[PDB]
Amino acid sequence: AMGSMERASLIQKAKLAEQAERYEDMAAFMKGAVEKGEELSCEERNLLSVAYKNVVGGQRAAWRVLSSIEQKSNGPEVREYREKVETELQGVCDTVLGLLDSHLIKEAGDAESRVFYLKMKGDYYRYLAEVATGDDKKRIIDSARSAYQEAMDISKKEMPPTNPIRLGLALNFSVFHYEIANSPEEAISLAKTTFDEAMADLHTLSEDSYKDSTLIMQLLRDNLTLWT
């Protein structure tokens, strides 16, 4: 639907939509920008991620409210409406995964871009896993695991332990272990090891980079406090 708008205009409008907190519009603009076929800059990758994270975040929150009501009940209305929201959520996840597969990941050669997109792929398979109950639940979980694992392997070879993308990836992979894979010990071990190696690398950072890294290390600490 965005094929007739300039790439630069789509990016500019995505930023305007963010300021207006119009995240559906933001995601549509960034989808159009991706479909121009050019690689995304660091800033542009962040716009893509912020847009869809906010859209799917609202769907996940709604799904959890409705699923809770459905459990307390078990007419068809509660199930029907939960299924409606769930289908809309799966459609957004499929759209993001389609953008990553066609063709963001295969053209991402730099560590910062490739790890970023693989983290995204793990995240949106994780969101599919949160609502999955059928014959493909195990395959969805393993698709999340595989994407996170490849991102982990690249990040440990190619980025310092304080890199914000590396840290956010480890944070989310640890949440995957705890919430999806039923592996709380793996979740705790990953979060602690990630935090400790980041701690030991903070001395190399400027004040601004130090603030970026410690912000995400605090989220790792919050989870460890919740989990232990």
Binding site: K53, D123, G168, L171, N172, Y178, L219, N223
Partner: peptide, 6 residues
Amino acid sequence: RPSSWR
């Protein structure tokens, strides 16, 4: 309940 990146 636990925090993913935000």
